[PDB]
Ligand SMILES: Cc1cc2nc3c(=O)[nH]c(=O)nc-3n(C[C@H](O)[C@H](O)[C@H](O)COP(=O)(O)O)c2cc1C
């Protein structure tokens with residue numbers, strides 16, 4: 001496998017120490033993955049996703065008219081870190097808590113990078129994030145009473161387009177501290193929805209989780225591999241290939257506060 | 258099917274009149290397809306072919322380094338023409354030779370367009386044609402005696418790279434008129450090769466047809482569909498999606514004459 | 515079928531793109547259909563619904579007395595729109611979000627027309643809407659406390675006529691914003707009823723959903739058919755034949771606010 005893992009000087013039981021640690025922090029820090037849906041991994045060779053359109057390049061008077069097919073190129077990221085090799089060997093002498101502080105700090109730089117692509121998009125990549133669809137904004141206020149009014153007025157914009165599913169509220173974590181009062185009034189105006197507090201946006205946004213409006217395309221899910229061995233340390237990396245696209249911008253609404 | 262053929266006012270026996278005519282002219286006029294090999298059609302939705310490389314876009318001091326995956330976008334061409342509808346109806350009264358002169362003139366504009374992409378490449382498409390690999394040139398002359406010497410010196414450049422298969426000579430059609438003398442001396446210096454005279458290049462070139470050095474990627478092979486009906490005529494089109502890439506430039510040699 | 519759908523230049527997979535879109539907006543925008551009941555479609559030839567009465571036209575001294583039987587004529591509506599044909603063809607190249615903005619704007623003109631017939635009735639059609647039965651009005655106020663009192667006084671008018679079923683509250687959407695406070699006090703004074711906020715009336719009204727008091731007669735449910743093909747566009751239409759009649763006006767009460 002392209003992740004040369006059977007070449008690293010680590011025991012088969014030391015590898016699972018590293019895997020569990022990274023798999024626990026990814027589950028809680030990948031916020032985009034809590035309301036978008038993932039098209040299963042297509043493999044390490046997948047390179048572009050079809051947009052389904054032609055881009056004409058010929059003249060208006062030509063006999064043979066032609067153009068190129070547009071697609072979306074996949075982003076590939078690689079983040080490397082180092083582990084002290086003596087400390088990892090203490091795990092064989094029966095030590096339950098080894099020092100992976102270099103693994104966890106790097107797992108959080110990657111999770112935070114993958115969320116600027118979903119929320120803010122990437123200029124060079126050709127990705128539009130959720131926060132740029134700014135013709136879907138609506139006012140709000142400061143009191144728990146007014147958050148309720150912004151959600152009943154948002155569900156009328158959904159039902160006016162035929163978007164009707166389970167609804168979700170993605171809200172900043174410091175704004176939520178003020179609305180802790182009506183946390184069961186809110187979660188039932190959404191009709192048994194779900195509140196996802198996140199330190200990745202300032203304001204809030206409501207989305208319809210009926211399925212198929214925000215796709216995360218995965219070529220290769222997050223993996224850990226082996227790079228090189230320095231004197232008394234190994235150098236590993238985290239890799240992934242993905243892209244993101246909003247299909248229906250009608251299933252999204254931005255609250256302004 | 259995307260070719261709305263069951264909506265054209267043509268009999269199932271008038272459609273095969275049109276298909277046979279276009280299939281006979283494509284067999285003789287698509288010269289590139291006589292020594293390159295075709296990766297079977299991937300479908301009407303295929304949009305890009307992987308080049309197998311990453312293009313880095315991050316800084317040198319960043320923690321999470323990333324880049325985009327390079328691919329080759331597929332060209333889609335459409336050429337339309339018109340058929341008089343009364344003349345096509347004479348085919349039902351038992352007429353063997355109807356007038357498809359509008360079909361054949363358009364089938365030759367398409368075949369000739371598809372060969373500038375293989376021999377000269379396309380700047381905007383991102384395709385390199387055979388005639389640009391100009392570090393593989395070698396001299397020649399004017400007499401049949403010297404054409405033989407240029408082929409024995411070309412087969413020594415092949416065997417020096419380990420390229421050893423059946424060999425082919427693609428030569429201009431007006432140059433060949435001079436070498437008609439030794440047409441069996443030539444075709445056995447190539448070791449039972451094959452001569453393909455073509456009005457698509459000035460000089461000649463020798464290629465190794467062992468397999469896998471010049472790939473034509475087909476999304477949708479050449480097809481005929483229906484567009485619209487004017488007053489007393491139908492309007493059809495010829496469509497195709499393809500791309501071309503040289504894998505090993507060592508299996509090619511350009512003679513200069 | 516009278517909807518000449520097998521004559522439109524659309525793929526069997528492009529037709530379902532159009533059907534799902536119109537079926538999703540009708541489900542949320544046809545508000546009358548949420549508390550009235552529908553007598554199944556009688557077909558495309560049904561033309562009139564019997565009122566069950568005779569209208570005498572003879573003299574008082576005649577030997578043979580005669581009259582005509584009264585019925586209710588069915589309304590037939592047709593709304594046409596246009597779709598760009600190139601954009602629909604992008605759906606075959608694998609595009610999930612094509613532009614049907616001309617379909618959805620027309621589906622909302624039709625849904626809103628069908629609701630003026632239920633709420634305001636039609637003079638020429640011979641239909642009485644719910645809002646004209648104005649001998650069933652009762653006062654209300656402005657505070658959540660008073661909305662509760664208007665519902666306990668309304669359920670005593672129902673039980674005085676023997677109308678006893680599940681109860682429903684159909685209220686303007688901008689009035690509801692004020693009563694968001696007691697949304698579980700309200701929905702249990704109705705004895706586990708149901709609140710249907712709608713932008714189709716100013717005030718509110720309470721109805722008994724026991725069955726058989728408000729009938730919507732359907733000849734042909736909402737359908738999409740094919741009309742003609744312009745140069746680079748198709749022209750489709752939405753059709754339907756229906757009529758509406760209140761059977762028992764005792765199962766209805768109008769709140770005045
Ligand atoms: C008792 C003992 C146990 C050790 N266990 C490990 C170990 O499990 N993994 C490891 O990478 N180095 C371990 N080391 C360190 C190496 O054996 C080696 O002594 C050190 O990396 C460099 O030694 P130097 O000062 O001679 O260059 C251990 C050293 C000692 C004295």
Ligand SMILES: Cc1cc2nc3c(=O)[nH]c(=O)nc-3n(C[C@H](O)[C@H](O)[C@H](O)COP(=O)(O)O)c2cc1C
Pocket residue numbers: 054056065066067333334335337484599600603604746
């Ligand atoms: C590469 C290419 C692809 C095309 N594909 C379509 C198509 O799928 N459907 C269509 O109606 N017209 C298509 N056209 C337009 C044709 O020229 C058509 O005969 C005419 O332009 C229709 O009018 P329009 O350009 O406004 O669509 C295409 C043109 C080109 C150059």
